[PDB]
């Protein structure tokens, strides 16, 4: 349990060291899988499911990002529970959307996927998926259980 509003977080395995070197242009490696607070603790993203490991980078250290909050508290190795309320998890619909797409392979930068991606929410009013429609639609808190595996340091 570290503090900021809305957030409760629950250490549920230990890391193997002193927390790491966040510093921006960090690369950092994880798994994830993200859960309602329902009954079922419905899962809707969990990146072993897919197959491989999720990688950010730290855009900057001293403006950091409200998932870089919950990675940046993480001592290598670190199995951690960060239950968040429904003011933070607005955004995880579109999150969740732009990772599913980089899943697939596509990027942004891709002119498509971002501008392909666009016409069809004006045209469809829809991310592309039915549970983040739905999610969208009816705010709430999630549960993130997040393991973090590797820091690396800048090229």
């Not at 190795?77 to 239950?83: K, L, P, R, T």
């Not at 607005?90 to 891709?110: C, N």
């Not at 929410?121 to 549960?143: I, N, R, S």
Request: glycine residues 8%; aromatic residues 8%.
């Amino acid at each position: 349990l570290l503090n900021v509003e809305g957030v409760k977080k629950t250490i549920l395995h230990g890391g193997t060291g002193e927390l790491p070197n966040f510093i921006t242009g960090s690369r950092v490696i994880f798994h994830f899988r993200t859960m309602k607070c329902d009954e079922e603790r419905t899962v809707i993203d969990d990146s072993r499911q897919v197959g491989q490991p999720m990688h950010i980078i730290i855009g900057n250290m001293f403006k950091l990002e409200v998932w870089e909050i919950l990675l940046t508290s993480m001592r290598v190795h670190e199995v951690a529970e960060f239950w968040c309320d429904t003011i933070h998890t607005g955004v995880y619909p579109i999150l969740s959307r732009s990772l599913r797409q980089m899943a697939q392979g596509k990027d942004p930068t891709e002119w498509h996927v971002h501008t392909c991606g666009l016409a069809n929410m004006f045209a469809y009013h829809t991310l592309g998926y039915e549970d983040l429609d739905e999610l969208q639609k009816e705010p709430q808190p999630l549960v993130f259980v997040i393991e973090l595996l590797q820091v690396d340091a800048p090229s």
